[PDB]
From TrEMBL, chain A:
Oligomer and partners: Homodimer. Erythronolide synthase is composed of EryAI, EryAII and EryAIII multimodular (2 modules) polypeptides each coding for a functional synthase subunit which participates in 2 of the six FAS-like elongation steps required for formation of the polyketide. Module 1, 2, 3, 4, 5, and 6 participating in biosynthesis steps 1, 2, 3, 4, 5, and 6, respectively.
Function according to Swiss-Prot or TrEMBL: Involved in the biosynthesis of antibiotic erythromycin via the biosynthesis of its aglycone precursor, 6-deoxyerythronolide B (6-dEB).
Domain of life: Bacteria
Name of this chain's protein: 6-deoxyerythronolide-B synthase
Entire-sequence positions represented here: 1448 to 1910 of 3545
Organism: Saccharopolyspora erythraea
Amino acid sequence: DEVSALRYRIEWRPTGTWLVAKYAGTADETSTAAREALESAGARVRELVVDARCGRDELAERLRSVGEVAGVLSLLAVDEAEPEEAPLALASLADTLSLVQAMVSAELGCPLWTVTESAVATGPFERVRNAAHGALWGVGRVIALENPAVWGGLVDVPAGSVAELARHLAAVVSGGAGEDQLALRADGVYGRRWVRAAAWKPTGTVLVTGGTGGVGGQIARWLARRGAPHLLLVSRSGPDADGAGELVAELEALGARTTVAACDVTDRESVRELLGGIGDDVPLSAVFHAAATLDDGTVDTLTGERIERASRAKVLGARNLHELTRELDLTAFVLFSSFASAFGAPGLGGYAPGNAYLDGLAQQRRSDGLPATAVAWGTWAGDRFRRHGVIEMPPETACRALQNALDRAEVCPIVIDVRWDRFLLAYTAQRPTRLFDEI
Amino acid sequence: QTVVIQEPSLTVSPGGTVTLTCGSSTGAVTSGHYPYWFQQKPGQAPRTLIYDTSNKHSWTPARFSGSLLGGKAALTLSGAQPEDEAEYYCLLSYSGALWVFGGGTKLTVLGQPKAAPSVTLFPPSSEELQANKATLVCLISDFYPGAVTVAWKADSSPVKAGVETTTPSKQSNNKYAASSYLSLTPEQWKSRKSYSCQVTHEGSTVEKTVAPAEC
Amino acid sequence: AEVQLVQSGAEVKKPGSSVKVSCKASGGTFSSYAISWVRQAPGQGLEWMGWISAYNGNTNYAQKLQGRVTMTTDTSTSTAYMELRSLRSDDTAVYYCARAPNYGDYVAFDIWGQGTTVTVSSASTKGPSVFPLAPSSKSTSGGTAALGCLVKDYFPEPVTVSWNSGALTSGVHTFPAVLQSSGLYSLSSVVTVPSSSLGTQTYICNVNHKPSNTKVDKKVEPKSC
C-alpha cells in the first residue's frame, strides 16, 4: 500500500597498452599481481605512478606522451590509510577525479577501472573497511552517466588479497557482461543490484541536525506528531534561524517540549558541549543527522578539495555524532543519504561522495553492534528531474516510510517514488546499465 | 537575526603586528562558518586574503594570517606596511545558504607624524545674503590622522541647525582635507554676536569664529 | 584564478524605477558555480544580497530584498544579471558580483567584480549658484590671506573650478563636494594669496558644470569695511 511501492535496497547477486595508475611505494604487491593477470590476456603493462594530490594539467601532458593506450586500471584506493583527519580528504578521491579529467584532456578514448579494498561488503557477514572509499563508488557512478567514454567501472576486493584479482580481472575489463559495479570474493564474483523490499516510538530527548531548516523542519514536526517527549533542534543559526520562533510554537502545540540550539556539527567541541548540555532528567535517545550539503555542477570541474569542503556538516557531523554516542545506549542513529549515492544522476557529483560515507558508516556501525540507519532519500517538498523519472514525495509520505524502515531496523533502505518507464530510458539514454535488471 | 561584530577601527605602526577579530551574536564562530577575510583599499573592490578560516590565496601577502582565537575569527597582520592601510571585512556562512558580513575594521597604518588641521571660516557673502543667507563655510586642510570631528557653536551650541560635514579626502600632501557647512536664515545670522567652527583632531580642537557685525 | 568578472557601467536612477546590473565571467568555465552579489552604501559596509546558480538557475535572496530583487544567468553570454525593482534613495550603493576561481567552491567569494555605482535620487539636474568668499581685512598675518568662492546647489556630481582662467594654480585647494539632504551638492574652492596683492591683482573663479552646460565667472573682491 502506497509506501511499499517506493521502498528498495541494494543486494549483491552472483554474476560474472594498459596503464596501472598507482602511488609510489603503495599497492606494489597488488600492482605486480594486476600486471601478471593483464599481459596473460595479451596487453603490454606499463606503470603510471602518481604524485599525492596531482595537478591535472601536468598529468594531462604525461598522458600526451605514452602513445596509443587501450585502457587504465587504478590502485590509488588500494593499500591506503586515512591519517586521522577529514574522511573525504582521501588522496585517491581527489586523484581519481583529476585522473579522469586528465585522460579526457589527453583524449585517450580508453576507459578507467578503479579497484577498492573491502569498501562494499557483499551482505552483513563482511565489514566495510574504510567508509571513505565508498565516495569513489558514488562519484564513479555519476562519472559514468556524465562521460561514458572514460568510465569502465568499479571492482571491490577483500582488504589485502591479490588472489581474486589474478583470475577474474582479465574477464572484468573485456567481458561483454555490462557489469560496471563488481565485487570479487573467495566464494565467486558478485554484481551490485537494485531490488524492491519486503514488508519504534521516540524517548527521552531526540536530536535533529538541520532541524531549523527544511527536511529537518519536517523531521522535527513529524517526530512531534508521532508523540516525542523532548526535541533538541540544532543548526549553525539555531534560534536566530528564520521562523525558528513559529516552529517551536507549532510543535510545542503537539506535546513536545522542544529547544533550538546553535551548533556547528563539524566541530568536535561544539557538539561535545551540546551533548553535555542535555538534562540528566531527559537523556539522549535518538539522533536524525539531516544537515545538508549544497554543491551543484558537473564532474568536468569538481575536485576532491571542493567535495571535502562542501560536505563537512553532513560528513564530519556523522563522524562526530557517531564518535560521541558510541558508548551511549540510544534507540535510532538516523543518517540522511540520497539517490545520488544509490544510483547517481548527472549533476549530483557534489552530493554522491558525502552520502556514500553515510551509507558506509551505518553498515560498519550495525557491523560493530550499534543502531544505525542510512536512508537514501529521493526528492521531497517545496521540472528537469520530474521529467527524467524521479518525482517528489510529500513530507508525511516520506516520514511514514521512515517509520517502518526503523520498525524493520534495516541498515540502508532506499525510499523514492520512481516512475520506472521514463527513468530507465533516461538513465540508459547514453550508457547501458545492468543494475536495474531485477525489477 | 545573527549580527557579526568587528572592531570599527584600529591603528598599527609600520613593523607592528595588529590582530582583528570577527565575533557573532548567535555563538562561537567556528570553521563550519567558513570565515573569509577581505581587504578594501579606498576606491577599490574587495580583494580576498583568507578563505576557510585559515587558507591563503597566492596573492595574499605572507604577513597576513587567519585563525580562530577563542570563539571569534582573527586576522593577524605581522610587520604591517603602509600599503596595508585598508578596511577589512569578515564573512560567515549560516543556515539556509545565508551569509552575513561584519561591519568592517578601518585599519590605519601611521605613515607620517600627527599634523593638526588648518581651519578657514568664511561668513555668508553679502551677495549670498540674497533670499535666505545661510552657508557658513568651514574648510579643513592638512592633517595626517584622516579623521576629525566638527562642532558648530553660536555663542551657545547649534548642531541641530543644518550642519553638513564632508568625509575626509586625501590631498596631494598625503594629508587630509574636509569641509563643513552651517545653513541659517539671514535673521538667524544677524541675531548672534558670533558663530564658531570647532574642528577636533586626535583630542585637540582648532577653532575659528566670525561675527555678523565687523569684517 | 584567471577568471575575471566585468560589470555594467555606472547607472543613475529616480525613485520607483529599476536597475539591471550585469556580471560577465571571462577567463574560465562558467557552468558549475553560483555568482553571489553584495552592495555597499557610500562609506558603509559590504552587505550580502544573494546568489544565482549558473548550473540550475536556483536563487537564495537576502530577506530584506525578497520581492524586489531578481538574479538571472545567460549561459550563452556567460554573464549573471542582478535586477532591483521599485528603487528608493537608500538603494544608492556600489553593487559587486563574486564567485570562485577556476576549480573552486560552488557558493564562493574568492574573485570580485570591479563594482557598479548605482545612484538613485530625486535629481532635477540643476546648475550651481556661485558666491564669492571675500578675503579677511584681518592682520597681514604671515603675509597671506584666503579668498575663494562657494559653488552651491548643483546636481550631476562633476563640477570644475579654475582661477584666473587657469593662470593661478599656486595655493588653490578646491574641496570635494558635500551632498545635502536635498539630493544637491555644494563645494568651495579657496586660494591662499599674498595680502599685499589684495586690491592690485584680480581673482576670478571660473566654475564649469558641463552637465547643465553652465560656465560662470565670479570676481571675488575685498570687502568695503
